[PDB]
Design a protein around this motif. Structure first.
Motif, PDB file in Angstrom:
ATOM      1  N   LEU A   1       2.249  -4.354   3.799  1.00  0.00           N
ATOM      2  CA  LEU A   1       3.494  -3.616   3.644  1.00  0.00           C
ATOM      3  C   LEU A   1       3.158  -2.223   3.135  1.00  0.00           C
ATOM      4  O   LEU A   1       2.515  -2.081   2.091  1.00  0.00           O
ATOM      5  N   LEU A   2       3.586  -1.203   3.869  1.00  0.00           N
ATOM      6  CA  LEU A   2       3.253   0.180   3.565  1.00  0.00           C
ATOM      7  C   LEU A   2       4.482   0.940   3.084  1.00  0.00           C
ATOM      8  O   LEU A   2       5.586   0.759   3.603  1.00  0.00           O
ATOM      9  N   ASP A   3       4.288   1.787   2.085  1.00  0.00           N
ATOM     10  CA  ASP A   3       5.310   2.718   1.621  1.00  0.00           C
ATOM     11  C   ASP A   3       4.713   4.113   1.766  1.00  0.00           C
ATOM     12  O   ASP A   3       3.870   4.519   0.961  1.00  0.00           O
ATOM     13  N   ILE A   4       5.143   4.841   2.790  1.00  0.00           N
ATOM     14  CA  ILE A   4       4.550   6.122   3.156  1.00  0.00           C
ATOM     15  C   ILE A   4       5.455   7.249   2.677  1.00  0.00           C
ATOM     16  O   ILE A   4       6.662   7.241   2.937  1.00  0.00           O
ATOM     17  N   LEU A   5       4.872   8.218   1.979  1.00  0.00           N
ATOM     18  CA  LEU A   5       5.603   9.362   1.451  1.00  0.00           C
ATOM     19  C   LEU A   5       5.325  10.579   2.324  1.00  0.00           C
ATOM     20  O   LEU A   5       4.185  11.047   2.401  1.00  0.00           O
ATOM     21  N   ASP A   6       6.359  11.079   2.988  1.00  0.00           N
ATOM     22  CA  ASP A   6       6.263  12.289   3.799  1.00  0.00           C
ATOM     23  C   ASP A   6       6.553  13.470   2.884  1.00  0.00           C
ATOM     24  O   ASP A   6       7.709  13.744   2.555  1.00  0.00           O
ATOM     25  N   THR A   7       5.497  14.168   2.471  1.00  0.00           N
ATOM     26  CA  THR A   7       5.625  15.248   1.502  1.00  0.00           C
ATOM     27  C   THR A   7       6.184  16.516   2.139  1.00  0.00           C
ATOM     28  O   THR A   7       5.912  16.839   3.298  1.00  0.00           O
TER      29      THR A   7
ATOM     30  N   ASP B   1      -6.825  24.868   4.590  1.00  0.00           N
ATOM     31  CA  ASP B   1      -6.081  24.395   3.429  1.00  0.00           C
ATOM     32  C   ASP B   1      -6.389  22.948   3.068  1.00  0.00           C
ATOM     33  O   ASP B   1      -5.868  22.452   2.067  1.00  0.00           O
ATOM     34  N   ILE B   2      -7.222  22.262   3.847  1.00  0.00           N
ATOM     35  CA  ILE B   2      -7.552  20.876   3.537  1.00  0.00           C
ATOM     36  C   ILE B   2      -8.294  20.788   2.212  1.00  0.00           C
ATOM     37  O   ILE B   2      -8.068  19.867   1.418  1.00  0.00           O
ATOM     38  N   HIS B   3      -9.198  21.736   1.952  1.00  0.00           N
ATOM     39  CA  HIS B   3      -9.901  21.739   0.678  1.00  0.00           C
ATOM     40  C   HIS B   3      -8.936  21.845  -0.493  1.00  0.00           C
ATOM     41  O   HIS B   3      -9.208  21.304  -1.568  1.00  0.00           O
ATOM     42  N   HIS B   4      -7.811  22.537  -0.310  1.00  0.00           N
ATOM     43  CA  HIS B   4      -6.819  22.629  -1.376  1.00  0.00           C
ATOM     44  C   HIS B   4      -6.218  21.267  -1.690  1.00  0.00           C
ATOM     45  O   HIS B   4      -6.160  20.859  -2.854  1.00  0.00           O
ATOM     46  N   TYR B   5      -5.764  20.546  -0.662  1.00  0.00           N
ATOM     47  CA  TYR B   5      -5.109  19.262  -0.891  1.00  0.00           C
ATOM     48  C   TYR B   5      -6.086  18.226  -1.432  1.00  0.00           C
ATOM     49  O   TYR B   5      -5.743  17.455  -2.335  1.00  0.00           O
ATOM     50  N   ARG B   6      -7.305  18.184  -0.893  1.00  0.00           N
ATOM     51  CA  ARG B   6      -8.302  17.256  -1.416  1.00  0.00           C
ATOM     52  C   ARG B   6      -8.614  17.543  -2.880  1.00  0.00           C
ATOM     53  O   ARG B   6      -8.713  16.618  -3.695  1.00  0.00           O
TER      54      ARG B   6
ATOM     55  N   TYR C   1       0.852  -1.184   0.000  1.00  0.00           N
ATOM     56  CA  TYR C   1       0.000   0.000   0.000  1.00  0.00           C
ATOM     57  C   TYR C   1       0.887   1.234   0.000  1.00  0.00           C
ATOM     58  O   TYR C   1       1.682   1.425   0.923  1.00  0.00           O
ATOM     59  N   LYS C   2       0.754   2.064  -1.031  1.00  0.00           N
ATOM     60  CA  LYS C   2       1.518   3.303  -1.139  1.00  0.00           C
ATOM     61  C   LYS C   2       0.701   4.431  -0.516  1.00  0.00           C
ATOM     62  O   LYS C   2      -0.359   4.798  -1.026  1.00  0.00           O
ATOM     63  N   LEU C   3       1.192   4.976   0.588  1.00  0.00           N
ATOM     64  CA  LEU C   3       0.502   6.028   1.316  1.00  0.00           C
ATOM     65  C   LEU C   3       1.230   7.355   1.140  1.00  0.00           C
ATOM     66  O   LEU C   3       2.451   7.399   0.979  1.00  0.00           O
ATOM     67  N   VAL C   4       0.463   8.442   1.174  1.00  0.00           N
ATOM     68  CA  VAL C   4       0.989   9.790   1.015  1.00  0.00           C
ATOM     69  C   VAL C   4       0.428  10.651   2.131  1.00  0.00           C
ATOM     70  O   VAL C   4      -0.784  10.649   2.369  1.00  0.00           O
ATOM     71  N   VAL C   5       1.305  11.380   2.812  1.00  0.00           N
ATOM     72  CA  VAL C   5       0.925  12.270   3.904  1.00  0.00           C
ATOM     73  C   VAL C   5       1.003  13.699   3.386  1.00  0.00           C
ATOM     74  O   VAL C   5       2.093  14.205   3.091  1.00  0.00           O
ATOM     75  N   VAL C   6      -0.152  14.353   3.267  1.00  0.00           N
ATOM     76  CA  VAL C   6      -0.239  15.711   2.751  1.00  0.00           C
ATOM     77  C   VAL C   6      -0.802  16.618   3.838  1.00  0.00           C
ATOM     78  O   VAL C   6      -1.475  16.175   4.773  1.00  0.00           O
ATOM     79  N   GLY C   7      -0.518  17.899   3.702  1.00  0.00           N
ATOM     80  CA  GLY C   7      -0.950  18.882   4.675  1.00  0.00           C
ATOM     81  C   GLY C   7       0.017  20.044   4.728  1.00  0.00           C
ATOM     82  O   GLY C   7       1.137  19.979   4.232  1.00  0.00           O
TER      83      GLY C   7
END
Ligand SMILES: C=CC(=O)N1CCN2c3nc(OC[C@@H]4C[C@@H](F)CN4C)nc4cc(-c5nc(N)cc(C)c5C(F)(F)F)c(Cl)c(c34)OC[C@@H]2C1
Ligand SMILES: Nc1nc2c(ncn2[C@@H]2O[C@H](COP(=O)(O)OP(=O)(O)O)[C@@H](O)[C@H]2O)c(=O)[nH]1
Ligand SMILES: [Cl-]
Ligand SMILES: [Cl-]
Ligand SMILES: [Cl-]
Ligand SMILES: [Mg+2]
Length: 168
Positions: free
Chosen positions: A52-58, A92-97, A4-10
């Motif tokens: 198995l997770l692959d998390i991207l810290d943006t 800013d959540i509306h921006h990322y979504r 699972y490829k995860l992305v952390v945005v904010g």
């Protein structure tokens, strides 16, 4: 096991790097380089299935080239993180979504709303305020605390379940 490829945005300073290390390394980092964007990996168990997770810290400059969108399109689930003591980060959540829906070319992308820094006393973003926003999005909402481990593993595992539902 399933990957699972995860992305952390904010927004910046909301705790994306702290939340990521609290799940991978199980400890709190009170000062990570805000300009560093890296990928982490760890295999955890989520409701029986080994994942198995692959998390991207943006992190870095906001930029929308075809290479960046294509790289961000590889993410299967997104953690939209805001700080309960920063009103701007919650607006800013509306921006990322909106940007996630654009690069993924879909209106039902697996994502989870995260209210970080819930260990702090003074709160400006109400719980039910962020709860009704996630209910409008149709996505889960969880409050986390990278310092106290509270809900950290919960927020990440909930995102993997959203991917599991969307896949089938
Ligand atoms: C310390 C700083 C830090 O950590 N920061 C600050 C910069 N910051 C980002 N700030 C923004 O706006 C910021 C403001 C708010 C709003 F008003 C519009 N902007 C003027 N927008 C970002 C957008 C993306 C992004 N880019 C793509 N190409 C595709 C997608 C699908 C995204 C995604 F997924 F994210 F949506 C990414 Cl990756 C970002 C963004 O990285 C995270 C960093 C984190
Ligand atoms: N009290 C508290 N502070 C936090 C928490 N998470 C992050 N921080 C603080 O927020 C600052 C920036 O966090 P950071 O990991 O860089 O978040 P990011 O910039 O959005 O990736 C750090 O100095 C941390 O001390 C938390 O759960 N509780
Ligand atoms: Cl572990
Ligand atoms: Cl970007
Ligand atoms: Cl655009
Ligand atoms: Mg960071």
């Amino acid at each position: 096991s399933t990957e699972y490829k995860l992305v952390v945005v904010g927004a910046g300073d909301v705790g994306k790097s702290a939340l990521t290390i609290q799940l991978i390394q199980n400890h709190f980092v009170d000062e990570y380089d805000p300009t560093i964007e890296d990928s982490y990996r760890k295999q955890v168990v989520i409701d029986g299935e080994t994942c198995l997770l692959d998390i991207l810290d943006t992190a870095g400059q906001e930029e929308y080239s075809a290479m960046r969108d294509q790289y961000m399109r590889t993410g299967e689930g997104f953690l939209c993180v805001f700080a309960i003591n920063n009103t701007k980060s919650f607006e800013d959540i509306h921006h990322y979504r909106e940007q996630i829906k654009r690069v993924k070319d879909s209106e039902d992308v697996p994502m989870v709303l995260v209210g970080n820094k819930c260990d702090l006393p003074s709160r400006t973003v109400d719980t039910k305020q962020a709860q009704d926003l996630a209910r409008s999005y149709g996505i889960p909402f969880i409050e986390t605390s990278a310092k106290t481990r509270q809900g950290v593993d919960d927020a990440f595992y909930t995102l993997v379940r959203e991917i599991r539902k969307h896949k089938e």
